[PDB]
Design a protein around this nucleic acid. Sequence first.
RNA 1: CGGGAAACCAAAGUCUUUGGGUUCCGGGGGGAGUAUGGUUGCAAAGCUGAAACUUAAAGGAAUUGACGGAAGGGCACCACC
Lengths: 82, 226, 126, 129, 65, 208
Amino acid sequence: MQSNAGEFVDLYVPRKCSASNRIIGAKDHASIPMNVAEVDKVTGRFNGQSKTYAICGAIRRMGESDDSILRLAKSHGIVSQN
Amino acid sequence: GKAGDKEWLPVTKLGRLVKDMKIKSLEEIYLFSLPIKESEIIDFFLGAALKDKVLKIMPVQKQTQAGQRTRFKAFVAIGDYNGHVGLGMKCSKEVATAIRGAIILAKLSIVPVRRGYWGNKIGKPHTVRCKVTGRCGSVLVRLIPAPRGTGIISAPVPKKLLLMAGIDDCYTSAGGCTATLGNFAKATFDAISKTYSYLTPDLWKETVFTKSPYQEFTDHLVKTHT
Amino acid sequence: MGRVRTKTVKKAARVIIEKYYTRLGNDFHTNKRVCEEIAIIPSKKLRNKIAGYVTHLMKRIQRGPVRGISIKLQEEERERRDNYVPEVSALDQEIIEVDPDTKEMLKLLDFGSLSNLQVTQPTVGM
Amino acid sequence: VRMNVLADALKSINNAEKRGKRQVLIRPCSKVIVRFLTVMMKHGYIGEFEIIDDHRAGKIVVNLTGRLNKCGVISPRFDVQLKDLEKWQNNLLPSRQFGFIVLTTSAGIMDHEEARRKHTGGKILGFFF
Amino acid sequence: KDPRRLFEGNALLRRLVRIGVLDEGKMKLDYILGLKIEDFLERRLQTQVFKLGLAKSIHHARVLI
Amino acid sequence: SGALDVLQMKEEDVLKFLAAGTHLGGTNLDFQMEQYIYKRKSDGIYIINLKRTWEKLLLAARAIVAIENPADVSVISSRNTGQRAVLKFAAATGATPIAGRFTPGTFTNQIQAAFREPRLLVVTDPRADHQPLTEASYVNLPTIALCNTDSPLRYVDIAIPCNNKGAHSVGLMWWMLAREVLRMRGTISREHPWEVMPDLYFYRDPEE
RNA sequence: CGGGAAACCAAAGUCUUUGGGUUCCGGGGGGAGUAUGGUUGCAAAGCUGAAACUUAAAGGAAUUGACGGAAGGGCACCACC
């Protein structure tokens, strides 16, 4: 949303679904993401450091949010042979 | 002014962050898509310097045992002039309450508007990024971007809503029973709100995004009560 | 019947009992005195009607926990009861008896286990 | 039966993206479908696609992101006169700025921007944004 | 660059500027689009004969003229 | 694997699971659950993928850690088989509770006396606990859930396939979650075994 | 999902983001399927089908009472027993 002199105008840049790459817009409160903890490898020891995904109202109402998370979590770990 | 400010106290964590000066703009709420249940939140973050215009009064009624009943319905719109607006309809026993509640309802509903450039983007957005339409029970309003000086070409009621929204120039076409005002304003309200939903190519790329002020402020938003 | 206690009364009874159980009693005569000490009630007939219904409750509570009333002592009693656990029941006794496939469930799960086979017959819907 | 084949491919796509789908199998495909899928691709509105070869007419798999609000087809394929292109994009595009009208000209199936630059014109195929 | 746009655009601008109605950055078409009535109204006699003392009223001005 | 090793399967657990008869799965699959399914037993019944049941449970556990204030993860059950179960989970991990008649207007509706703003809901039957699952979707709160093969997938992100027909399957899975979360961001340390007997989770019930 | 004014509708969906093929009928309500000419019919009638004039609502859907010689309901010696 540039303006004349490369300036950034209007007022915000919305987050985009983690499954459908579609704008979460802005009053659709039937939607939320999901912070997964990073682990200090080895195992346990929750260390931050979120691995995070945002899922749209749409996907969730269509009886996905879950799987989407899995394509999301495995593709970037953890989660394997799902 | 001096009348003795109330004592808002918040039900909601979102509210605590706002009063604490932890949340400062609605954008945070909008990006997070936090629901807003306490009207004061809207009041503190914006609304200050936001003006509410009452659109309509028309009465209705329904039948009692021993005959009749009748009551007042008020249609209220709220918005600064830039980028924020809300719409609220209420029916109540008394005009004042109907208006007073309507305003509250309008504020809760406040919505983002994405305002854009008819084409050559100099000196900040005059119109709308794309063309967005909204329908409410057979009335449908279509907003179209227009060149500068075009202004809001809409019916008076719609012009008023679009005005508060902060749109400078826009073309409109309306189909359906335009007469039923509650419907027409509602559709236009849906239309404007749809601008944020449009994905343009500018938007195509993504983002660490945010952690949510709810999470960072979490302690802050569990005070010392219960 | 004709005497159905109204909420203003019934509420007070639930009320007192919640904050008064170990104080209150089995007997009308005494709670009635107690309502003077632990509550401010405007007419004597009301206070009587209250004492009376709350006693009907105490009589009932002291014979089985009653649908919506909680007191510190009753919580403690349930707490202690809610401990029980024997020799224990599964065992299940030497050797699990499987339905097979459930046998093939372990067999193809990389898992040793105790055994027994009796799993055959199909198998109608409804 | 079938009059056109493009219109089916486009619709199939649109319903895929509307569902929340990330792939589609269109059938049966054609040189024109490829060319249109291709113009879309150059611009970002779809990912990569693949023509599978049944011994028949073809089947395409399109992998789609989600930048696509709509890809429509215009029927019939009206003739356009260089200053009817200006009239078309306004009729059916979101802002002057973006979205493409894609037509077929003597010098190739192209988006109207490429049309304006070449300085040729022709008959209108469809659009997207 | 379109001979029609160039030849007539520049002319509209130059005409709009001779009368002071319009200014240079304006003085392109992108700016006339973002213009208004006062800008014309400001150039009539009447308001000038005020604007340099020689009337002291938009009033006086019109009866003077 | 992933996070790197020890965290994998452990026969010890695959033993508790098979014992508790989790994997047994519903005769009616349901479409969104098809992935969980390992194989269909003869005489109709499906074998859930314990390996899959396992890993997701861990994925669940991890999402429960990362919530900073442990209290505001709500473990929920109106089902009896899961009532002591969740009460126990809430005792160990921070985790506030919601058993029995969920009470409508608990997430929407400030005014109410069971008003809660969780940052994570964990539900045990998405069909029995449909109210909480719906209310949660009125206010942007993620959901872990107990799902057998034929449970509603609407508004639930993250499933852990179970059996939820019942027994100890509901007991063990809540147990293992609390066991897992205490390990992560907690302080069990040494994704080594339990001083707590898993029976402690598990339904009570009646009396003669 | 989405549609529709709703009742409803997996088609009445993919319709203002309005464009897959083709065919038919309607443009407030009455006058009227009437007059009149043509046509078909043994006949009874059928098809095509106006106007003058008349009139500001005709109509649809949902909502709620009122009311029922509709169904289950009750309550009272201003009801019966």
